[PDB]
Structure formats: C-alpha cells, structure tokens
Design a protein around this nucleic acid. Structure first.
Ligand code: NA
Ligand code: NA
Length: 324
DNA sequence: CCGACGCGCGCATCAGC
DNA sequence: GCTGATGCGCC
DNA sequence: GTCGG
C-alpha cells in the first residue's frame, strides 16, 4: 500500500480507457505507469517526484498532485457515478463481452448480469459461458489445485498417446502461489512445421470423457479454449470452474513456445533485446541467425528448451528465477 | 509535431460481395 | 456460398 | 498518455 492509492487510480483510469473510451494505447500507458510506480520503493509525495519515472508524464503527474492533495480524482469520481460508463466497464468483466459488446448492450438497456440473464438470446455462445461462470472466473486458482489439475491433464494426455508431450506453462510453471487459468502446451512427434492435425481434438475429447473439461469457449485445430473443474469427493463443496487453454504446437517450435508462454513476460524482452547482441533472432516459434544486413537465415533445430541457452549461450535459469 | 505503441495469434462472428 | 475485417481473450 | 524521431 506504499503507492496503492496511486496505482489503483492509474489502473482504474486504465480500465475505463480500455473498456469505455476504447483507447488501448492509453490503457497500456496507464498500466505502464502503474507498473513503474508499484515497484518504486518510496511513498511518492509529488507528481513531480513521480514524473522522473519512465512512463509517468505531465498529465499523470498532475493527476497525482490532485490525488495527493484531496484524496480523490474529480474525473474518476464523476465516471464512477456515471450509469452508462460504469455499466460498460462492468459488463466487460463477462468473458466474451469486450468493450464493443458492452457498448452495444448498454445502448439497448442491458446494464447488469440480470439484464443479460433475461436476454440470453442476444449473447453468443462464448458470452453465455462467461455469464454462467462469471463468479468462478474471477476467483484465482491456488497452486495446490493447479497440481491436481496438472495431474489429470498429464495422466489423460499420456493415456490417449504416450508420445504426446504436454507442459503446463503460465506463472504456475515458474512456481506461482496461484494462477488465473491453466495454459497447456501440447505436441506430438507427428506434428512438424511441414505437416497431420488430428491431435488436438483427440486430447480435448479424452478430457471431456472423464468430465474434466466441462464447456468449450472456442476450438480449432491448434488452439482450444474452455472450462474445466476438479472432481468433488461427493460429500464436499464442489470446486469452482476454471478457464483452460490447450495449444498444439509443432515439435521443432514447441520449446520456443514453452519458453515464450512460460516467461515471465518482461523476462522475455530482456531475453530478446539481449538476444541479438549475440546473433540469433528469437520470437515465439524459432531461433534464427542474422547477418550484417539483418535478414534471417533458417532456424536451427531447437529440440530442448535449453538450446536457446546454447545459441545465445546463457547459463541455466530455470522456471523458478525467470521473474525478469 | 506527429506516429508508435505486441513490426501479436487462433478462433468465432459480422459485413459484404 | 466465399473472403476479409473486426471482436475477443490470453503468455 | 508518454515517449522519441
Ligand atoms: Na517520465
Ligand atoms: Na470481457
């Protein structure tokens, strides 16, 4: 809570910019500000003190002065009591309702969850499933539930084909106390960049046979997005439903994907800006050499995560320590 | 001053032909 | 019927 | 909104 009142404000402003204003660069500007402020180790006492930080400019500085002198933000107080704006903001908390659907709904008088319940006919399939599990989807997932979840995912995936490789990435892979969802990266030997896609459906189908996956938000041939729920012990309170994603990557790109999706995020930007001060370009799929021109060669065979630690030649930095 | 800002990705849905 | 654009939720 | 060419 050193600067919590300031970051809460910047994050509040950010959400309104994303959801009501539909100004995504302001959203990220506000969130960037909140990030550098949350990590600044002093109780900020002035907008001017703040403006020294990268991502804090004049306007956010002035907003801090008003916050620090009066407790509040006039613009925020006003927006907060504003029925149209705050309804739009709120409906975006329904998964499948982004800022356009929420603008559309608040135009036609749908402002609340109940209003959606009375107009299910006007929600696509994703939105219905977001509305149904609205509460569950806002709970975090404790690491201990992630382990049981990961037990089921790996058990069943090896059950369909012992040659599948599955990895749970996300902050969970780095050891997090809790997770917001489960991101599962899938691969098979029979799936290369130069390849046949039957493999995702087989795994989704097995996880629905054991009633682990309960609903389907979107499915294709390389990405699945849906809902899962741990089995209850018959007598106990039933676990909340959880968001789950499963990505079928090719094998020659898999460990690039594992690294990318594991992260953490800013770990990778260091990992990448400081990747090419060495001569091997990196993204999410491949590591490719460059030349004095700057055009890429052809990517060299990463078949374990740690050949991105040979090609750029860092030592071992495991899931654990990739905080940045 | 004025554009960049994830030099972003898979899938579901809509606008349009 | 199709393509391309736009909406969406994410590491 | 903040940065930088
Ligand atoms: Na600054
Ligand atoms: Na939403």
């Amino acid at each position: 809570t050193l600067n919590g009142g300031i970051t809460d404000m910047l994050t509040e402003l950010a959400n309104f910019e994303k959801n009501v204003s539909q100004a995504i660069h302001k959203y990220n500007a506000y969130r960037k500000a909140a990030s550098v402020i949350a990590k600044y180790p002093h109780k900020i006492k002035s907008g001017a003190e703040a403006k020294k930080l990268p991502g804090v400019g004049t306007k956010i500085a002035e907003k801090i002065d008003e916050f620090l002198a009066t407790g509040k933000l006039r613009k925020l107080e006003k927006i907060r009591q504003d029925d149209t704006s705050s309804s739009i903001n709120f409906l975006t908390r329904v998964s499948g309702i982004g800022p356009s659907a929420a603008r559309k709904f608040v135009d036609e008088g749908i402002k609340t969850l109940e209003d959606l319940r009375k107009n299910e006919d006007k929600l696509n399939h994703h939105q219905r499933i977001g509305l149904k599990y609205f509460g569950d989807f806002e709970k975090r997932i404790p690491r201990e539930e992630m382990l049981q979840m990961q037990d089921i995912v790996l058990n069943e995936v090896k059950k369909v084909d012992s040659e599948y490789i599955a990895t749970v990435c996300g902050s969970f892979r780095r050891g997090a106390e809790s997770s917001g969802d489960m991101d599962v990266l899938l691969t098979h030997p029979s799936f290369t960049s130069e390849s046949q896609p039957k493999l995702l459906h087989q795994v989704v189908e097995q996880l629905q046979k054991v009633h682990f996956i309960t609903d389907t938000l979107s499915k294709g041939e390389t990405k699945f997005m849906g809902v899962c729920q741990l089995p209850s012990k018959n007598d106990e309170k039933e676990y909340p439903h959880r968001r789950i994603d499963i990505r079928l990557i090719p094998k020659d790109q898999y460990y690039c994907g594992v690294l990318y999706f594991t992260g953490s995020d800013i770990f990778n930007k260091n990992m990448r800006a400081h990747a090419l001060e060495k001569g091997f370009t990196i993204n999410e799929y491949t590591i490719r050499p460059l030349g004095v021109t700057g055009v890429a060669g052809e990517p060299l065979p990463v078949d374990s995560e740690k050949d991105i630690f040979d090609y750029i030649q860092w030592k071992y930095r495991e899931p654990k320590d990739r905080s940045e």
